[PDB]
Design a protein around this motif. Structure first.
Motif, PDB file in Angstrom:
ATOM      1  N   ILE A 205      10.716   7.373   6.667  1.00 29.96           N
ATOM      2  CA  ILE A 205      10.934   5.867   7.193  1.00 29.96           C
ATOM      3  C   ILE A 205       9.663   5.415   7.484  1.00 29.96           C
ATOM      4  CG2 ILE A 205      11.991   4.854   9.124  1.00 29.96           C
ATOM      5  CD1 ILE A 205      14.435   7.089   8.746  1.00 29.96           C
ATOM      6  N   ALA A 206       8.589   6.124   8.064  1.00 33.91           N
ATOM      7  CA  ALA A 206       7.477   5.239   8.585  1.00 33.91           C
ATOM      8  C   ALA A 206       6.651   4.824   7.633  1.00 33.91           C
ATOM      9  CB  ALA A 206       6.923   6.232   9.564  1.00 33.91           C
ATOM     10  N   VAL A 207       6.365   5.599   6.454  1.00 35.87           N
ATOM     11  CA  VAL A 207       5.554   5.187   5.347  1.00 35.87           C
ATOM     12  C   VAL A 207       6.206   4.117   4.492  1.00 35.87           C
ATOM     13  CG1 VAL A 207       6.098   6.984   3.654  1.00 35.87           C
ATOM     14  CG2 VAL A 207       3.686   5.672   3.665  1.00 35.87           C
ATOM     15  N   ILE A 208       7.465   4.138   4.568  1.00 33.84           N
ATOM     16  CA  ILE A 208       8.359   3.023   3.633  1.00 33.84           C
ATOM     17  C   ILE A 208       8.277   1.722   4.588  1.00 33.84           C
ATOM     18  CG2 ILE A 208      10.282   2.200   2.448  1.00 33.84           C
ATOM     19  CD1 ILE A 208      10.882   5.284   1.987  1.00 33.84           C
ATOM     20  N   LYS A 209       8.404   1.791   5.802  1.00 34.32           N
ATOM     21  CA  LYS A 209       8.223   0.607   6.760  1.00 34.32           C
ATOM     22  C   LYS A 209       6.902   0.078   6.807  1.00 34.32           C
ATOM     23  CE  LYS A 209       8.726  -0.923  11.412  1.00 34.32           C
ATOM     24  NZ  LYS A 209       9.089  -0.608  12.738  1.00 34.32           N
ATOM     25  N   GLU A 210       6.081   0.918   6.487  1.00 34.13           N
ATOM     26  CA  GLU A 210       4.589   0.446   6.534  1.00 34.13           C
ATOM     27  C   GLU A 210       4.146  -0.237   5.287  1.00 34.13           C
ATOM     28  OE1 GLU A 210       2.410  -0.525   8.678  1.00 34.13           O
ATOM     29  OE2 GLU A 210       0.544  -0.373   7.723  1.00 34.13           O
ATOM     30  N   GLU A 211       4.553   0.189   4.132  1.00 33.80           N
ATOM     31  CA  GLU A 211       4.839  -0.026   2.687  1.00 33.80           C
ATOM     32  C   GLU A 211       5.332  -1.547   2.639  1.00 33.80           C
ATOM     33  OE1 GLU A 211       5.933   3.146   0.529  1.00 33.80           O
ATOM     34  OE2 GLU A 211       4.221   3.510  -0.387  1.00 33.80           O
ATOM     35  N   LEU A 212       6.471  -1.944   3.181  1.00 31.88           N
ATOM     36  CA  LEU A 212       7.246  -3.034   3.308  1.00 31.88           C
ATOM     37  C   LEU A 212       6.198  -4.062   4.232  1.00 31.88           C
ATOM     38  CD1 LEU A 212      10.985  -1.857   3.466  1.00 31.88           C
ATOM     39  CD2 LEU A 212       9.890  -3.217   1.676  1.00 31.88           C
ATOM     40  N   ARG A 213       5.764  -3.369   5.256  1.00 32.56           N
ATOM     41  CA  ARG A 213       5.115  -4.382   6.210  1.00 32.56           C
ATOM     42  C   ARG A 213       3.799  -4.952   5.449  1.00 32.56           C
ATOM     43  NH1 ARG A 213       0.741  -5.237   9.165  1.00 32.56           N
ATOM     44  NH2 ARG A 213      -0.381  -2.988   8.765  1.00 32.56           N
ATOM     45  N   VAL A 214       3.038  -4.113   4.703  1.00 28.61           N
ATOM     46  CA  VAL A 214       1.888  -4.867   3.938  1.00 28.61           C
ATOM     47  C   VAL A 214       2.165  -5.500   2.500  1.00 28.61           C
ATOM     48  CG1 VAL A 214       0.308  -2.950   4.823  1.00 28.61           C
ATOM     49  CG2 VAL A 214       1.339  -2.335   2.677  1.00 28.61           C
ATOM     50  N   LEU A 215       3.284  -5.156   1.928  1.00 29.25           N
ATOM     51  CA  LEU A 215       3.846  -6.072   0.877  1.00 29.25           C
ATOM     52  C   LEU A 215       4.088  -7.367   1.378  1.00 29.25           C
ATOM     53  CD1 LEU A 215       5.858  -3.507  -1.118  1.00 29.25           C
ATOM     54  CD2 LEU A 215       4.018  -4.541  -1.783  1.00 29.25           C
ATOM     55  N   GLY A 216       4.958  -7.345   2.560  1.00 27.78           N
ATOM     56  CA  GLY A 216       5.281  -8.498   3.381  1.00 27.78           C
ATOM     57  C   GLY A 216       4.077  -9.443   3.415  1.00 27.78           C
TER      58      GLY A 216
ATOM     59  N   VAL B 133      15.057   8.708   1.835  1.00 30.92           N
ATOM     60  CA  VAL B 133      14.926   9.053   3.271  1.00 30.92           C
ATOM     61  C   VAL B 133      15.843  10.530   3.376  1.00 30.92           C
ATOM     62  CG1 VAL B 133      14.266   6.847   3.998  1.00 30.92           C
ATOM     63  CG2 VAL B 133      16.545   7.591   4.466  1.00 30.92           C
ATOM     64  N   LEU B 141       4.383   2.386  -3.465  1.00 30.58           N
ATOM     65  CA  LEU B 141       4.482   0.800  -3.325  1.00 30.58           C
ATOM     66  C   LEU B 141       5.197   0.023  -4.537  1.00 30.58           C
ATOM     67  CD1 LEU B 141       0.662   0.526  -1.916  1.00 30.58           C
ATOM     68  CD2 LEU B 141       2.604  -0.645  -0.783  1.00 30.58           C
ATOM     69  N   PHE B 153      14.474  -8.548   3.366  1.00 28.07           N
ATOM     70  CA  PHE B 153      13.786  -7.413   4.311  1.00 28.07           C
ATOM     71  C   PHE B 153      14.692  -6.909   4.887  1.00 28.07           C
ATOM     72  CE2 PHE B 153       8.935  -7.154   4.308  1.00 28.07           C
ATOM     73  CZ  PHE B 153       8.831  -7.003   3.268  1.00 28.07           C
ATOM     74  N   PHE B 161      16.528   2.881   5.108  1.00 29.48           N
ATOM     75  CA  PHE B 161      16.768   3.472   6.250  1.00 29.48           C
ATOM     76  C   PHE B 161      17.916   4.380   6.564  1.00 29.48           C
ATOM     77  CE2 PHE B 161      13.207   0.517   8.436  1.00 29.48           C
ATOM     78  CZ  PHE B 161      12.469   0.900   7.584  1.00 29.48           C
ATOM     79  N   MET B 221      -3.760  -7.030  -2.350  1.00 30.70           N
ATOM     80  CA  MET B 221      -4.354  -6.334  -0.927  1.00 30.70           C
ATOM     81  C   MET B 221      -5.737  -5.972  -1.530  1.00 30.70           C
ATOM     82  SD  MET B 221      -1.213  -4.042   0.448  1.00 30.70           S
ATOM     83  CE  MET B 221      -0.705  -3.443  -1.224  1.00 30.70           C
ATOM     84  N   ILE B 229      -2.731   3.573   2.576  1.00 33.90           N
ATOM     85  CA  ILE B 229      -1.195   3.850   2.343  1.00 33.90           C
ATOM     86  C   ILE B 229      -1.218   5.029   1.820  1.00 33.90           C
ATOM     87  CG2 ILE B 229       0.872   3.041   0.967  1.00 33.90           C
ATOM     88  CD1 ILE B 229       0.359   1.475   3.526  1.00 33.90           C
ATOM     89  N   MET B 232      -1.452   7.975   3.665  1.00 35.18           N
ATOM     90  CA  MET B 232      -0.094   8.169   4.626  1.00 35.18           C
ATOM     91  C   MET B 232       0.975   8.834   3.724  1.00 35.18           C
ATOM     92  SD  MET B 232       0.464   4.608   6.766  1.00 35.18           S
ATOM     93  CE  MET B 232       2.153   5.149   7.246  1.00 35.18           C
TER      94      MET B 232
END
Ligand SMILES: CC(C(=O)SCCNC(=O)CCNC(=O)[C@H](O)C(C)(C)COP(=O)(O)OP(=O)(O)OC[C@H]1O[C@@H](n2cnc3c(N)ncnc32)[C@H](O)[C@@H]1OP(=O)(O)O)=[N+]([O-])[O-]
Ligand SMILES: CC(C(=O)SCCNC(=O)CCNC(=O)[C@H](O)C(C)(C)COP(=O)(O)OP(=O)(O)OC[C@H]1O[C@@H](n2cnc3c(N)ncnc32)[C@H](O)[C@@H]1OP(=O)(O)O)=[N+]([O-])[O-]
Ligand SMILES: CC(C(=O)SCCNC(=O)CCNC(=O)[C@H](O)C(C)(C)COP(=O)(O)OP(=O)(O)OC[C@H]1O[C@@H](n2cnc3c(N)ncnc32)[C@H](O)[C@@H]1OP(=O)(O)O)=[N+]([O-])[O-]
Ligand SMILES: CC(C(=O)SCCNC(=O)CCNC(=O)[C@H](O)C(C)(C)COP(=O)(O)OP(=O)(O)OC[C@H]1O[C@@H](n2cnc3c(N)ncnc32)[C@H](O)[C@@H]1OP(=O)(O)O)=[N+]([O-])[O-]
Ligand SMILES: CC(C(=O)SCCNC(=O)CCNC(=O)[C@H](O)C(C)(C)COP(=O)(O)OP(=O)(O)OC[C@H]1O[C@@H](n2cnc3c(N)ncnc32)[C@H](O)[C@@H]1OP(=O)(O)O)=[N+]([O-])[O-]
Ligand SMILES: CC(C(=O)SCCNC(=O)CCNC(=O)[C@H](O)C(C)(C)COP(=O)(O)OP(=O)(O)OC[C@H]1O[C@@H](n2cnc3c(N)ncnc32)[C@H](O)[C@@H]1OP(=O)(O)O)=[N+]([O-])[O-]
Ligand SMILES: CC(C(=O)SCCNC(=O)CCNC(=O)[C@H](O)C(C)(C)COP(=O)(O)OP(=O)(O)OC[C@H]1O[C@@H](n2cnc3c(N)ncnc32)[C@H](O)[C@@H]1OP(=O)(O)O)=[N+]([O-])[O-]
Ligand SMILES: CC(C(=O)SCCNC(=O)CCNC(=O)[C@H](O)C(C)(C)COP(=O)(O)OP(=O)(O)OC[C@H]1O[C@@H](n2cnc3c(N)ncnc32)[C@H](O)[C@@H]1OP(=O)(O)O)=[N+]([O-])[O-]
Ligand SMILES: [K+]
Ligand code: NI
Ligand code: NI
Ligand code: NI
Lengths: 260, 260, 260, 260, 260, 260
Positions: A205-216, B133, B141, B153, B161, B221, B229, B232
């Motif tokens: 969940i954490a790494v997928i959340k961060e991947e979505l954040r940087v893609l966003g 998950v 990515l 999103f 999740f 990016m 990434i 991670m």
């Protein structure tokens, strides 16, 4: 304990409840500092999901940016260290899902705050307004970007240009909300989904959340583009209209905007 | 012919039907290699539109990744030349429309695969889940990006999740699907749309599909953010939780994730 | 003051009505030049919102590109200074909101035109098509990008690959339209919103619109990728299919495309 | 105090002298951890300029990557939290100028480390080599990027493809170095420049340094391109040639590379 | 004619000569407004090449920013529409070559101004420095970027962090200058090259210059990176050190910077 | 065997020698097709380094574009699949080092071609000119970008705007060349370096060359900026001046450019 939030833990889920009802949970610096401290205090392996909420029965979820803490003119009102700018970054970088559980009316920077969170589950009676054009405030690029990842451009522009409230039903239809439930079912519907997420793999969940954040965030521009936008923002926070919007709020009257 | 797919052509429309029902059309290398060969073999001027389908009456459209092909060692199973990564690129770069025609349940990598296709037409009884998950997999990515071009999103995060299935009716409402049809009408509805597309200008379709592909990829990016990434993801692959997620699925038991 | 448009000013709202109905408001240069002049002339502080409309009762809102202005010998008709490319830039850069108030059928370049505008409010009987695959036109990157900010990729590809019309109700459901109203309510609904917007802070509206424009454009690629796409577009313009698509439209007959 | 560096402070200038002569200042984890701790300890308002140096008289400035620590297993030895990767990020993000004062031979990772610093002042007898092609190491994107901001592409490719040493005079001529000094004047010259910088406005130096860092890093690519490069690098660290290069270095023999 | 410049045309070459010697050609708004008017006036097909110069025998080419026009604190000193920011854009976008012909010393914003021009030809006695760290000025991203396209990063950092002058010979060695010539030969040498350029294809020069401009600009970043940098710059222009730097310059004394 | 090149391999080094002296090794399609076939034939594991050269004693290394193959009809002569555009991509993508070993004068597209190679070693008598402004040709973004990775912007703009020849000594000083040697040492010096490179790890060289290629291309822009540039280039190829430039070259006279 915290002056401006109350925290309860149920198994692996933490629920952060706003306690700033005296200013309708406006995003004042001291309120956001306690919200950020409470999140940081919950960043431990045995907590897997956060819920943000207003107290049960709230008419107002949050009145948005504290209008009294906006600068008087001649200064950027939404600089990188502004409390709204801090809380949205912290929600988006937080390595656990954050669910906004909404009862009551949501205003301006509070709407951006819940949009920055991972899921939004709302009461059938909740309403949503984006209001900076009521005050003449030049919203910042990061803030606007945070509003563009759910509903389409035409819908976002209607919300921001009209500053008119939309219902929970319309916010579901256009993609802003995940679920709408009757207010008596809101807490236990949200907790059921939070406990279900809490049995899944938290590092995934954490790494997928961060991947979505940087893609966003991966909409890139050159320095000249950014400085051009910043110069336009400066002409707005230098304008007579910005002073009029602040004064009309102070004097509880309708502003008279003239385009300078 | 092909061991793991069956191909039918109706004038300008080709249908690629899965023939791997013994393994619920799991995305094993031997199956993906046959699907890719069948697609490559259909890259001919007299073919104008592709339909991907499971056999009529399938309970499971595709079970997603083959657990038995997922390395417990370091090795990333979502590296550039892994079969799921190859076939999504091939579908996206293919100069003809590819329609996913869905009967049955869709899981994980198979959900990403239909999301990578151009249109999705589904039976009213079809269901959709995104499952990494459940095992602790750090989905890559490119793979996550492929899930972000349809629903917003908040909806994507709820799917990933929770790993909970959604109905065809909810997948239509949130923008994942083009059409939902009764299962008895699915094949004819899909074929008539494919034949209709096949009367349009193929070179125009190809360049507009390619323009959409490169605009959809154009989230850029810097190198540091990509390498951050990857670090991670490697930490997730090296975790105790990743071992537990794979062993739990192989042993048919509930995993106990602990967050290291 | 204009041959091909009529302008009415009601307080701070300006309504620009097409006056080219004898050619179904096809995007002829002379029409688009008058539209751009009337818009430019309205860029004054006492004008706060624009509505674009076809005359009351129109069966066809706009028939899209003028076939007689489509160059046979070589020339890209979607080059940077072609009228449709100029008017979409002008609409997106215009520092006031522009609402497309739609009655009748919307086709091709006119669909891109209303998609470039800020809000779309449509009659329940209005219909929408994107048509370049009917003629074999390799629609340009910027023009395609203008179609991707509202509905998701699967929907956009259905619209473009089928060139089939969609109802107002479907356009609302997929996120293309803000509102659908009965034709008798279209003026009242649209003007009430436009007057409401005109009460808000115009400089805040302008800078937020411009922030959204630049974020919407911030899908960046390298020079080689651009040149590669332009080579593919040139190959479509040089095709026998492109000649067939224009000749079939001119001869009012069904094109027979062959893939070269 | 630190086991592997010696720190002297002279007013606003701090000199960090390597104390790892036992392994010729190879970038072992224990040495780099002490170097980073010393830098962190010096991040105080009254320090304005850092000098990095080897002890006076050293024939070797730094032997580069510790090859007893480059894993001959599978793992990428240039992953995000590898010591060389950490120290370059720390040097580039450090809000004070860092000057590499070089006496002796500089190798491989140590060359990337001084290239990541703000200024390089070198003895007339110092030499410079970039050595990953001696071992078959697939150097990482960030690491290669750090070698491209001073000398041109042709010059960089000669350095990397030949792995041949260049003189201080050639390194000055191609733009790698700021100054070349006789060794007996190296310390006096460097300290005089460090004291001079220390008289300037530190907050302006810090923000301009950070502006250059982000502009330096602003070469952006899409996720697919990064994953494609990642898959090429993995093929290299999985090669027979990679095992041969590491073994040949350990056994002090010439490697026999075969292209797999 | 112009109060603060003198213009002569020789065949297709125009020489814009500074006429602000009483203020050492400091970049006052009144001077830059005249320089920009002269340039606009010369945007004519019969003009092919521009030379910018100070009067023959000038000791100071330009003393850089007018420190009487620097805002006092709390205000960005290098906003988009500040005169130095306007003239560097205008130089870069001007469709003819602009050659800086330098006699005398060049300081600060005047150094950025000549760097923004297409070629620099200088007297053997000319000197160059970049001085914002002398005053505590947070130089803006676009302005710093304009300094990075000629010399390497280490050289640029030495110039900015020391604020020390370099000779014409060193500026030639590091790639800043095109040519250095004896002062007696400066006018004839520069005019010969400008006349030569004036016989080449002006539309090819103009599009290649513009291609170079947008490639030079094409270092892209996300909005959060830009806003983080702007927050850092604001902390500098809010600092006591910035006030002290401006006061010390006006009181002709050495500043005492303390890091807040 | 090849009509327009001669290939000699010894051990791991291949020398490709131009055999088109009767047309001064002009970049005619038939010549570039043979060069690309010879390079493709040499993409074998036992070949580790390529040298490109003209025959011993050549006065002209390559005359650049064949003016007989430049279209006068309104076709872009630097389109994606133009032979010069193909060979620069093929050299940059080639997984072995390519050394340009230059004897004689180098003109226009041939200058771009050697700049696209990895190293340049030149005779002391060699000369270099970039000539599109001699003919009025709007050089394409990718081709201009290929000229910007060695010398600085001011130098590049002098080369292009003057079209004047530079010596090998100056080409070395400004960072274009790796080495300049007396012509009688050119083969021995270049073979020594090529055989030295061939002893290094080829898979490491290949992935570092590809990392450099991707970083070099990673200057990204939005679609509007590319389409705006395209429009400017088209106005140049539609120019009177472009016709005049090609006519003057064919008639062996000086062109008279007018800025239309
Ligand atoms: C990011 C951003 C923003 O968020 S701007 C802030 C946007 N917020 C808004 O537009 C909401 C403004 N407030 C309202 O519309 C109304 O106050 C609400 C929220 C619907 C509540 O209406 P009510 O009738 O129940 O309560 P009421 O107006 O009486 O307000 C209760 C008290 O809280 C004060 N208050 C309400 N919203 C506030 C805010 N956002 N900041 C500071 N004070 C606020 C209000 O002035 C009053 O003060 P007083 O006690 O001194 O009179 N931006 O860019 O502009
Ligand atoms: C760049 C590009 C193009 O250039 S496409 C070029 C052709 N345009 C399109 O395909 C856009 C879609 N439009 C259409 O399919 C058709 O215009 C419409 C919607 C079907 C309606 O066509 P109809 O034949 O029904 O029109 P109707 O017979 O009612 O025609 C009423 C009047 O409008 C004229 N007219 C209609 N459509 C026209 C058009 N697209 N261009 C020029 N004139 C048009 C027609 O000649 C007649 O005038 P006349 O009496 O003086 O001759 N592109 O991307 O597609
Ligand atoms: O809807 P369908 O499934 O029938 O597909 P589709 O219309 O694309 O098959 C093409 C038909 O739709 C018509 N059409 C296309 N765009 C339209 C629009 N915006 N409004 C009304 N009709 C339209 C088109 O001209 C053609 O009419 P026609 O009946 O004379 O051929
Ligand atoms: O051209 P060159 O012939 O100088 O290249 P070459 O790689 O052979 O390098 C000449 C010698 O300098 C060595 N070398 C590499 N980088 C070096 C550096 N920064 N300083 C001193 N020597 C270095 C390299 O190991 C080789 O060692 P060796 O002689 O002990 O084997
Ligand atoms: C980033 C990166 C790299 O940095 S590759 C590594 C590049 N480095 C090199 O090629 C330099 C390796 N070292 C040498 O060439 C020679 O040691 C030096 C620098 C020329 C000097 O030769 P010397 O005769 O003076 O000293 P010597 O070789 O004996 O080395 C002195 C001591 O340091 C050890 N040592 C030297 N270089 C080392 C290295 N790179 N890693 C680990 N230990 C090293 C060596 O084993 C010995 O320890 P010991 O007492 O336990 O046996 N990469 O990925 O490619
Ligand atoms: C973009 C940017 C910058 O440009 S930074 C600041 C850059 N400017 C500089 O660094 C230049 C500092 N100025 C100086 O050092 C000196 O004034 C000169 C150029 C170096 C040379 O030394 P001098 O002894 O000749 O100064 P000088 O005595 O000749 O002074 C000659 C005349 O010019 C006026 N003047 C000189 N520099 C000036 C300035 N920067 N602003 C306004 N007036 C100035 C001065 O007031 C006097 O006029 P007055 O007679 O009416 O009072 N930035 O961000 O930092
Ligand atoms: O080499 P340097 O010794 O000049 O380095 P440094 O930074 O000290 O500065 C050397 C001297 O040249 C002055 N300076 C700065 N930029 C200059 C330029 N472009 N031309 C001439 N002098 C300059 C600086 O003000 C100082 O004068 P000052 O004596 O009034 O302080
Ligand atoms: S459009 C890209 C522009 N290309 C260029 O600028 C290359 C320009 N070429 C030159 O400056 C000179 O022609 C060269 C390279 C210096 C060599 O001069 P030379 O005195 O040695 O030989 P010369 O020019 O007389 O050339 C011998 C023959 O080669 C022809 N030629 C030279 N360069 C050519 C080119 N790039 N394309 C086609 N023909 C060319 C020239 O027109 C002449 O034709 P002809 O036999 O039919 O009359
Ligand atoms: K006009
Ligand atoms: Ni996007
Ligand atoms: Ni203080
Ligand atoms: Ni760059």
């Amino acid at each position: 304990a915290y002056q401006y939030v109350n925290v309860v833990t149920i198994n692996k889920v933490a629920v952060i409840e706003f306690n700033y009802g005296r200013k309708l949970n406006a995003l004042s610096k001291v309120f956001i500092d306690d919200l950020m401290q409470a999140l940081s205090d919950l960043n431990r392996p045995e907590i897997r999901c956060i819920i943000l909420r207003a107290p049960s029965g709230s008419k107002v979820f949050s009145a948005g940016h504290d209008i009294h803490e906006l600068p008087s003119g001649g200064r950027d009102p939404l600089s990188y260290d502004d409390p709204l700018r801090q809380i949205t970054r912290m929600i988006q970088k937080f390595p656990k899902p954050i669910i906004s559980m909404v009862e009551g009316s949501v205003w301006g920077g509070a709407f951006e705050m819940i949009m920055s969170s991972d899921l939004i589950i709302a009461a059938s009676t909740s309403t949503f307004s984006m209001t900076p054009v009521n005050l003449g405030v030049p919203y910042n690029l990061v803030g606007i970007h945070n509003l563009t990842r759910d509903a389409g451009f035409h819908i976002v522009k209607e919300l921001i240009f009209t500053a008119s409230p939309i219902t929970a039903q319309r916010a579901l239809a256009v993609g802003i909300l995940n679920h709408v439930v009757e207010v008596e079912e809101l807490e236990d519907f949200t907790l059921q989904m939070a406990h279900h997420i809490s049995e899944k793999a938290p590092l995934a969940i954490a790494v997928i959340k961060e991947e979505l954040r940087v893609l966003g965030e991966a909409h890139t521009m050159n320095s000249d583009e950014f400085e051009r936008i910043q110069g336009m923002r400066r002409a707005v926070y230098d304008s007579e209209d910005y002073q009029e919007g602040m004064n009309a709020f102070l004097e509880k009257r309708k502003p008279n905007f003239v385009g300078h």
